[PDB]
Amino acid sequence: SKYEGRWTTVKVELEAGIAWVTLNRPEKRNAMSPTLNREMVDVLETLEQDADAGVLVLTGAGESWTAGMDLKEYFREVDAGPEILQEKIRREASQWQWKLLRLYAKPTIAMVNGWCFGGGFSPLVACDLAICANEATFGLSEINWGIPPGNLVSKAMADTVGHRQSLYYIMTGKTFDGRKAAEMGLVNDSVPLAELRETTRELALNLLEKNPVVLRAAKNGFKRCRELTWEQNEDYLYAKLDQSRLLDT
């Protein structure tokens, strides 16, 4: 494999234009350690410039998507350093989870095969589209660990899940399954685990057929237009269209 052995906590496999990105700490339910965060920044920067990768799928090894932030590894790394290390460690989490990922140049799909807890909600929603297994379990367990949702988790909910349901799951920390995730709008679809890869693959190959520059303008302009008024968007959306026409040539 082009990327075999390159990262310790992540695996990347290219197949016919699809970059399958697997969070790969299965014994730790792919908990996002500071090492995983630095490696995932490198994965996204590398795949952005890899002409053979037209779409990214973000999935988890084993029975986990990600259980969220790795408590042990964060604090061993923070407590060993001055205050300023926490600022860098948070930036590294943000950098892959949404600063590069949410407005990524290439289309992105979360393939949620299992556990998706806490911090995993940020990259889940930064990913453009999402398919889960029926068998997947989700939760915002932060409240039961004595922290409010950290990083962009609460905004990830605010963008995808209705006000009342967002507050219910944030406030109670109750778990929910793949069907509920799809019903609430957190993902596009929930399917049996045995059909997850094929469902994700057909969507990925659909996106691969689109003009990349046009798809980028369309998906990323939509995300930004949510934040702008109609008068502001007249200007912004026509600028993205004209920008698309320049960069396609």
In the bound state with its own copies, the residue whose beta carbon lies nearer, of 10 and 153, is 153
Query: Residues 54, 68, 114, 119: which is the catalytic one?
Result: 119
CA distance 181 to 210: 28
71 annotated among ligand-binding-site residues: yes
Q: Among residues 148, 179, 195, 198, which is the contact residue for its own copies, using CB under 8 A? A: 148
CA distance 154 to 93: 15
Q: Which residues within the stretch 66-95 sit at the binding site for its own copies (CB under 8 A)?
A: 82-88, 90, 94
Q: Which residues within the stretch 92-121 sit at the binding site for its own copies (CB under 8 A)?
A: 94, 98, 102-103, 105, 107
Query: Residues 120, 142, 169, 178: which is the catalytic one?
Result: 142
Total residues binding its own copies (CB under 8 A): 94
Q: Among residues 185, 194, 195, 198, which is the contact residue for its own copies, using CB under 8 A? A: 185
Please tell me the total number of residues recorded for the chain in this structure.
Answer: 249
Q: Which two tokens stand for residue 129?
A: 């589209």
In the bound state with its own copies, the residue whose beta carbon lies nearer, of 5 and 163, is 163
CA distance 184 to 178: 10
Q: Among residues 14, 143, 193, 208, which is the contact residue for its own copies, using CB under 8 A? A: 143
- Span interacting with its own copies, options 17-25, 32-40, 67-75, 208-216, rule CB under 8 A: 208-216
Assess whether 236 carries a catalytic annotation. no
Our finding on whether 175 is near its own copies (CB under 8 A) is: no
- Span interacting with its own copies, options 9-17, 22-30, 68-76, 219-227, rule CB under 8 A: 219-227
Our finding on whether 4 is near its own copies (CB under 8 A) is: no
In the bound state with its own copies, the residue whose beta carbon lies nearer, of 197 and 224, is 224
Our finding on whether 225 is near its own copies (CB under 8 A) is: yes
In the bound state with its own copies, the residue whose beta carbon lies nearer, of 179 and 223, is 223
Query: How many other C-beta atoms are found inside a 10 Å radius of the C-beta of residue 211?
Result: 11
Assess whether 69 carries a catalytic annotation. yes
CB 178 within 8 A of CB 193: no
CA distance 67 to 223: 26
CA distance 201 to 16: 11
67 annotated among ligand-binding-site residues: yes
Specify binding-site residues: 28-29, 67, 69-72, 118-119, 141
Specify binding-site residues for CoA: 28-29, 67, 69-72, 118-119, 141
* Residues taking part in catalysis: 69, 74, 119, 142, 238
